[PDB]
Amino acid sequence: DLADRFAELERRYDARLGVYVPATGTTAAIEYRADERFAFCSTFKAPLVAAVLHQNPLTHLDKLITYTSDDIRSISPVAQQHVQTGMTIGQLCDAAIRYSDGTAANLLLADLGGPGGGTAAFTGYLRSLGDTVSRLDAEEPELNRDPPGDERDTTTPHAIALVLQQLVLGNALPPDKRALLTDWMARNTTGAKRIRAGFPADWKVIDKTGTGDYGRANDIAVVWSPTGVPYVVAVMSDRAGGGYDAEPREALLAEAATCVAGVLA
Amino acid sequence: DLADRFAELERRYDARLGVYVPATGTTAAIEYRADERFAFCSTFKAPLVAAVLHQNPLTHLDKLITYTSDDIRSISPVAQQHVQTGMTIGQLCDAAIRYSDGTAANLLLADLGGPGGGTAAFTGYLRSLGDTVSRLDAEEPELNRDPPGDERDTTTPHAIALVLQQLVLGNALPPDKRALLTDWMARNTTGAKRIRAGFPADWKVIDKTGTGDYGRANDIAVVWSPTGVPYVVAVMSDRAGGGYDAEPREALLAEAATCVAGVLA
Amino acid sequence: DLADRFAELERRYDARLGVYVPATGTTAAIEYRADERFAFCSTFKAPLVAAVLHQNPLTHLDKLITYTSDDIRSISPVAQQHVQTGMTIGQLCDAAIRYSDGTAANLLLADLGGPGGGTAAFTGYLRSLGDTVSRLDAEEPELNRDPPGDERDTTTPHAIALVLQQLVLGNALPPDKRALLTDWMARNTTGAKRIRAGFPADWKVIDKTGTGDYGRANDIAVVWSPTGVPYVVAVMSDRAGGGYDAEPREALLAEAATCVAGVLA
Amino acid sequence: DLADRFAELERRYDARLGVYVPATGTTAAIEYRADERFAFCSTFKAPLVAAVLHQNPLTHLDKLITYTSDDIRSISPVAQQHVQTGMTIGQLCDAAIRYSDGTAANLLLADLGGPGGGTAAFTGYLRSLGDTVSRLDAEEPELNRDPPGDERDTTTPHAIALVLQQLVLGNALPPDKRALLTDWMARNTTGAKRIRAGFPADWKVIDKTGTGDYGRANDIAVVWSPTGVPYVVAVMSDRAGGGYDAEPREALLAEAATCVAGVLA
Numbered sequence A, B, C, D: 001d002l003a004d005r006f007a008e009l010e011r012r013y014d015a016r017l018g019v020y021v022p023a024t025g026t027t028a029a030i031e032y033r034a035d036e037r038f039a040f041c042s043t044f045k046a047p048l049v050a051a052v053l054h055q056n057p058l059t060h061l062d063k064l065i066t067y068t069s070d071d072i073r074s075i076s077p078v079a080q081q082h083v084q085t086g087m088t089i090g091q092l093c094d095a096a097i098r099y100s101d102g103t104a105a106n107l108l109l110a111d112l113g114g115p116g117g118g119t120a121a122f123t124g125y126l127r128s129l130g131d132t133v134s135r136l137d138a139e140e141p142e143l144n145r146d147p148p149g150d151e152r153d154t155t156t157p158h159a160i161a162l163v164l165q166q167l168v169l170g171n172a173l174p175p176d177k178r179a180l181l182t183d184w185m186a187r188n189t190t191g192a193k194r195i196r197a198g199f200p201a202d203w204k205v206i207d208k209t210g211t212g213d214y215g216r217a218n219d220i221a222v223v224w225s226p227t228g229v230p231y232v233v234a235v236m237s238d239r240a241g242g243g244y245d246a247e248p249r250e251a252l253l254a255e256a257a258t259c260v261a262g263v264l265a
């Protein structure tokens, strides 16, 4: 009867909607296509920064990474302003989470090192979290482009929600690093019209968006009730039936979120 | 399931909760104790103003109403400061709705004329709108003091939603007067922590609160979805079993609001 | 060049304006007719409360004072709701400051005891604060009605500002009682259009209004800058040239207040 | 004496303050560094939109503008979410004014056409309004990064105040387009802590902010007194001597505005 509304949202927006809200002490899990695969798009950038924070002392944030204009591919509002100066790892994190900067994501992946420009190590980091389903295989911007049915660069609402839960509410990171990740997510600039727009203002919402082709629009959020109770909300969506150029529907995610807000109220 | 969620709100907040949202083309009616009686409190001030607008040309709003300190018998944030100046009917309407001014309501009731200082005339106005259930019996401040179980000064969420629906979305008032009422409710200063607090920010909420003893807390709203689709939302609550001094719990109204929002999204 | 703006305001509103802002460490005193006499009106109710708190061991706030309808004189939104209940001193304090309740002020005056229904003791309380200038001679509502030029029931902006300064920023009261007075002033419901309306929202404003005949409109405030710097602002006004029935002008007080805010920024 | 207070602010905030308020019938102009050059930053986005409106029939607002990830080279809260969807000229105007979107500004500059990617046409539009002083030389984001003393991408408080005056209060724009601009400025989301924070809440403030390196913080506003009298407030500031990374002091602009309000009250 919650599922009835999500599928009505799917019909409204001609979209495939994936939602996961992990169970807590007081609420049952919310699952709609919780285990179907959806493309990460930029949502991997949040666990990416967690991986970077994990592998390395806080001090590593100050390392200056220089890069060239040839490295700038995909939306990079911050990295485009810093080719000449370079960027520290730390700000690369900042840009990757708060602005969904793709160049910053690629540099952080390279900083993870290893085959596929870091994707195997980032996949590995998710595994160290118990997420065996998700995988990152390409860099920005290729990871937004895989056709439907392709398992590359996909997660599921279930897996990615649980990952975020460990990163923000659990002990994946020592409190020092958990605060930095949580702060960047909290000051994200890309999610205003998604999960943030679907919850009442007095719910705190930290989130990481993802947007890609085939109408891919994701949002991963930690939301706090007015009473301060946290819930992890994974909302993922695509419109593959509309082809590569199918437009993402931000309103779809805000609606799905309001529905989740209604069950969490 | 929605009824189940309301029942938990009721249990959580030691309160009796009444919710009504009239059906639309796209949504079924939402009813929880839709036909149980709850005390008006200052929620009557909105149809009160409608009555004055209905039986008077607009220019009647400019009429100067003078009154004495002896008329200041209830909380009157605006009327208390204008004993020496007088106040126009227009100003009284504004004060009754936006500040829940009790003297302004009594003076608007007086402007209605008839037995009981306007209370029979205002009830009659509810009758001409098809509300056979509601009744206003006392003035400010007595109408907030009636004991639980007494039908005096009571309405139901069903009835008041239907009244508010005709006033804001229907043709109870010509567009002239409808705009003035809609504006006053829209700039209401008392409802931020009630239905407004439960709906996402991109929803428009115009509302009239009511608060009284026995933990009475009401909010009647017309809300517009981001798509611009209107809904009438009546939420009434009391904690009468907690006696006269029971504190109203606004968060219950915000929670009930969020649940409704989740079903309407 | 500030006197030029106040006298501008006086000319605009056909009014006598009295302004006093005590000097602080960094700012000079602001004085406009700071030492001319203005009628207390209800502004005495705030130091009245400080008097009651000063001479009683706090438990006295719970003492129940009963009164009769013949005792209800002048604007009394709270007292006229508690006749069969009576009202505790605490409630009377709260009513006198936050609602300017005149009946509550008279009962607190009586509770100070002595000739003239407490007015001599209250004057005496002011003397203990170093204000040798002010005097209270009548109860509500007579104290608002003295003709211009009559020294009875008058203070000066200078005098009341320093009095309020000691009550809120100094040590007239022990910290317990100072908290009760300040909180009452902070939640005052009567000053929204006076000093409060002249200062930017991010300046905190606690205040006590006074209004009377001859266009008497006062507001005494303690204001806190966005930096948290306190200032005492006494703004008093009458329009005696317009006779007993002269209307008070709140906008004069907000404008004068804005002028002050410009100097204190 | 106002100048002395502006100098204190300058000392207080280690900042250079530029203030202009054009004369009206009742008030003399307020000038402090009125003819000194300050960097535009995003305040140009307001006349930029007017330039687009001036050159185009309203019908042009619905024209769909498409762009690529390479166009996202500066902070673009709205445009970065619409690379796959594209954006309407109207949306771009809205985004440029209300969210200070850097990409929306560049597309609107491009919409003006001509040398420097629209920069010459925009400067010319300022020239056609009688602004002989101001110049736009770079697009976003370079136009925020000119070193102190460099005249590129600078205006004066005098010039921009007069430009803003003609746009909102004069006849630079026909009434239909003038309302769209005024509406966009009125719903600005970035000016809460500047001129708005320094004027009393009952003053109406529409504004366009600007922020850049060297501690640059501007706010240009049209403000209406409670009586509805309009005033243009140009406040510009930088902390250039503090180097590229100086950060802006919004409270300086709010404090400066409070000073202006006190003289205009």
Ligand SMILES: CO/N=C(\C(=O)N[C@@H]1C(=O)N2C(C(=O)O)=C(CSc3nc(=O)c(=O)[nH]n3C)CS[C@H]12)c1csc(N)n1
Residues within 6 Å of the ligand: A098, A187, A188, A189, D075, D077, D098, D099, D100, D189, D190, D213, D245
């Ligand atoms: C929740 O996000 N809301 C935003 C939004 O998109 N804001 C962004 C955000 O967080 N921003 C930040 C920064 O990253 O710190 C900034 C600073 S960006 C910057 N800092 C420097 O130190 C520097 O040298 N150069 N630059 C360019 C301002 S707003 C933009 C917003 C824009 S308008 C509005 N009403 N809200």
Ligand SMILES: CO/N=C(\C(=O)N[C@@H]1C(=O)N2C(C(=O)O)=C(CSc3nc(=O)c(=O)[nH]n3C)CS[C@H]12)c1csc(N)n1
Residues within 6 Å of the ligand: B041, B042, B043, B074, B075, B099, B100, B102, B141, B142, B144, B145, B189, B190, B191, B192, B208, B209, B210, B211, B212, B213, B214, B215
């Ligand atoms: C005899 O009357 N008794 C009253 C009474 O006058 N109630 C009126 C009523 O319905 N009113 C409304 C409103 O419109 O909701 C209100 C509630 S608004 C409000 N009040 C606050 O103190 C506050 O901090 N925030 N907000 C938002 C004002 S009282 C009036 C009363 C008030 S509390 C209580 N237990 N009884």
Ligand SMILES: CO/N=C(\C(=O)N[C@@H]1C(=O)N2C(C(=O)O)=C(CSc3nc(=O)c(=O)[nH]n3C)CS[C@H]12)c1csc(N)n1
Residues within 6 Å of the ligand: B075, B076, B077, B098, B099, B100, B189, B190, B213, C098, C187, C188, C189, C190
């Ligand atoms: C700060 O002033 N602003 C006001 C205003 O006048 N609010 C008042 C204020 O502080 N109020 C209070 C109370 O006494 O706590 C209340 C409580 S009234 C009340 N409470 C009881 O417990 C009871 O037994 N009886 N009654 C009557 C509600 S608003 C009024 C206002 C009016 S509309 C709006 N948005 N604000």
Ligand SMILES: CO/N=C(\C(=O)N[C@@H]1C(=O)N2C(C(=O)O)=C(CSc3nc(=O)c(=O)[nH]n3C)CS[C@H]12)c1csc(N)n1
Residues within 6 Å of the ligand: D041, D042, D043, D074, D075, D099, D100, D102, D141, D142, D144, D145, D189, D190, D191, D192, D208, D209, D210, D211, D212, D213, D214, D215, D247, D248
């Ligand atoms: C290369 O450009 N450099 C920029 C820049 O993008 N400037 C633009 C400009 O003028 N903008 C404006 C605005 O409209 O004022 C703003 C101010 S918005 C804002 N962000 C916050 O985080 C916040 O807490 N409050 N507010 C109000 C965003 S940057 C853009 C910059 C911003 S801070 C800094 N040191 N440089």
